[PDB]
Amino acid sequence: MIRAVFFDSLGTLNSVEGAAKSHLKIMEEVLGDYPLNPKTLLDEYEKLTREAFSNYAGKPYRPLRDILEEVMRKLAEKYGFKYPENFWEISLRMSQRYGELYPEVVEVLKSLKGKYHVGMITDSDTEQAMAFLDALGIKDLFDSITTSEEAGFFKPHPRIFELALKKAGVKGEEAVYVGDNPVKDCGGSKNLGMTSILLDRKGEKREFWDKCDFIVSDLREVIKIVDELN
Numbered sequence: 001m002i003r004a005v006f007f008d009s010l011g012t013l014n015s016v017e018g019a020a021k022s023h024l025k026i027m028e029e030v031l032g033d034y035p036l037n038p039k040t041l042l043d044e045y046e047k048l049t050r051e052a053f054s055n056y057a058g059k060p061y062r063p064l065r066d067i068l069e070e071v072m073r074k075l076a077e078k079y080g081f082k083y084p085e086n087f088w089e090i091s092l093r094m095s096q097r098y099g100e101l102y103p104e105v106v107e108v109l110k111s112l113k114g115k116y117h118v119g120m121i122t123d124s125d126t127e128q129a130m131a132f133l134d135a136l137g138i139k140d141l142f143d144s145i146t147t148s149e150e151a152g153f154f155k156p157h158p159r160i161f162e163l164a165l166k167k168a169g170v171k172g173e174e175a176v177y178v179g180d181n182p183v184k185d186c187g188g189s190k191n192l193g194m195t196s197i198l199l200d201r202k203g204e205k206r207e208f209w210d211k212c213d214f215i216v217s218d219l220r221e222v223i224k225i226v227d228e229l230n
């Protein structure tokens with residue numbers, strides 16, 4: 001039976017309308033006064049990271065700090081603004097301020113907790129992951145936090161799911177994984193036997209609904225699915 005429920009972080013629990021805001025303010029901070037539109041830097045930044053996250057998918061871990069910094073240095077040299085050494089520090093500050101949870105998050109974690117092992121599986125560095133959960137105040141709502149730094153590999157590599165299943169002591173078939181990336185989340189968890197639930201609040205990922213077992217648009221639908229399976 002289902003004795004565990006695992007969630008992704010970005011795009012699943014934190015409001016993308018909140019991450020987007022934070023990132024804009026990060027770039028505004030880095031610039032300010034400099035004759036470059038902050039929104040233009042943001043879009044170029046997102047393009048570069050997207051490519052970096054694409055190139056490391058399912059491969060050996062490498063500090064996200066070094067990756068994201070190679071990108072900013074690239075952009076600073078390209079546009080001529082001062083590379084902020086405290087880029088990593090400024091990033092966190094803006095997250096803790098403008099980053100927020102989707103409305104039903106606490107509600108859902110509470111229900112699943114107690115009766116089912118509740119864990120997190122993220123590609124983020126371990127320290128970044130802790131500070132983040134601590135900022136949104138949901139650290140103690142999890143029984144386990146599993147990261148790529150700990151597994152040595154990024155999603156969808158199987159090792160990051162295996163490790164989370166071990167920390168829990170359950171078998172893949174006895175576990176569920178909730179995420180918003182059809183291939184990285186659902187495709188990855190699937191290789192371990194886990195039951196996959198794709199979150200798609202905007203109803204856009206219709207094109208990739210088949211790669212997943214279930215499709216929800218509100219995390220409250222997960223408690224339903226679980227019991228239905230038990």
Ligand SMILES: [Mg+2]
Nearest residue numbers: 008010011180
């Ligand atoms: Mg995601």
